[PDB]
Amino acid sequence: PLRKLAFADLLQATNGFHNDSLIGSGGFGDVYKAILKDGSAVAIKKLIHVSGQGDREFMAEMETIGKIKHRNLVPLLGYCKVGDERLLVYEFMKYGSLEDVLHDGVKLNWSTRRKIAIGSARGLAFLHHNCSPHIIHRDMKSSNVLLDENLEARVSDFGMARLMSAMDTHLSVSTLAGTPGYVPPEYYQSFRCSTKGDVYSYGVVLLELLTGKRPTDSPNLVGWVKQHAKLRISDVFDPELMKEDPALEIELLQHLKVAVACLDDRAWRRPTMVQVMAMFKEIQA
Numbered sequence: 001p002l003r004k005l006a007f008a009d010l011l012q013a014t015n016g017f018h019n020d021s022l023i024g025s026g027g028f029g030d031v032y033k034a035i036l037k038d039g040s041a042v043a044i045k046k047l048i049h050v051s052g053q054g055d056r057e058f059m060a061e062m063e064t065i066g067k068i069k070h071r072n073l074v075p076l077l078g079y080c081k082v083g084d085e086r087l088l089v090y091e092f093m094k095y096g097s098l099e100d101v102l103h104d105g106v107k108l109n110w111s112t113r114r115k116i117a118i119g120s121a122r123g124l125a126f127l128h129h130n131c132s133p134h135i136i137h138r139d140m141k142s143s144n145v146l147l148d149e150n151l152e153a154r155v156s157d158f159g160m161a162r163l164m165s166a167m168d169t170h171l172s173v174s175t176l177a178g179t180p181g182y183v184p185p186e187y188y189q190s191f192r193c194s195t196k197g198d199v200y201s202y203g204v205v206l207l208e209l210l211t212g213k214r215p216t217d218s219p220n221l222v223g224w225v226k227q228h229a230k231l232r233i234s235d236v237f238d239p240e241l242m243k244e245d246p247a248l249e250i251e252l253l254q255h256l257k258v259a260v261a262c263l264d265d266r267a268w269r270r271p272t273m274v275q276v277m278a279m280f281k282e283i284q285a
């Protein structure tokens with residue numbers, strides 16, 4: 001069950017929110033590495049700009065990830081709401097964000113990379129299909145995919161998530177949300193979001209697992225791949241991934257076709273995360 005944590009507990013667990021506990025800041029809020037008085041290894045997110053862009057992000061997580069539990073979603077263990085202070089407590093993911101592992105670190109062979117791809121996809125599919133009302137993440141990133149002790153992918157950061165009824169195809173919102181390099185093209189043309197939007201953002205992450213490069217490189221990534229898709233597809237994959245096995249590229253290309261389908265400019269043409277799961281299943285069979 002979720003747990004209402006005293007503000008004092010979080011205060012002393014992080015040594016007065018000391019800099020030594022700080023493992024991430026900027027944007028939404030600070031993230032601290034901490035150990036609760038019961039011995040739980042946790043991460044604590046201190047939200048800034050409360051009663052506005054901070055209280056909305058707070059509620060968004062409480063109303064979505066705070067109410068559900070899944071093997072491939074970051075667990076929200078607890079929360080704290082006092083005055084204008086808003087904090088969130090998650091279980092600590094040992095290897096941090098996928099972005100941190102992908103750049104700067106440990107080694108990720110393809111067998112574990114595809115398990116990261118399957119898991120994160122399974123997490124999203126759960127949000128889109130097994131949850132009523134449906135949950136739209138709206139900020140799927142490599143930095144918002146955490147890796148636990150087993151290098152299993154766990155989708156994180158529901159600060160900008162929204163609830164959509166199962167009888168609808170899209171949700172009209174107040175603001176444009178997302179991260180540059182991950183934003184679906186149609187999110188620019190309208191104030192409407194959808195699960196298909198999340199699929200696109202997932203595609204970019206799958207590309208990061210395949211190429212190894214940031215989405216921003218290099219003139220962007222999605223565009224450059226689409227162009228080289230008509231050229232030599234062999235000169236696009238991750239160098240360190242080909243050293244493992246050259247006869248595995250047939251599986252890599254099939255995974256790439258999954259990534260490309262997700263990245264279609266047309267939302268209606270994109271596969272659902274259930275289809276993405278089903279494609280992964282038919283690839284290794």
Ligand SMILES: Nc1ncnc2c1ncn2[C@@H]1O[C@H](COP(=O)(O)OP(=O)(O)NP(=O)(O)O)[C@@H](O)[C@H]1O
Pocket residue numbers: 023024025026027028029031042043045074090091092093094096097100139143144146156157159179
């Ligand atoms: N449970 C956790 N375990 C380990 N590291 C974590 C955990 N939660 C967050 N982090 C780290 O802290 C970073 C920031 O967390 P996050 O929840 O994405 O903050 P954010 O500000 O809402 N993201 P954004 O606003 O899009 O830049 C992540 O990229 C991880 O490196």
Ligand SMILES: [Mn+2]
Pocket residue numbers: 143144157
């Ligand atoms: Mn984030």
Ligand SMILES: [Mn+2]
Pocket residue numbers: 028139157158159160
């Ligand atoms: Mn966020």
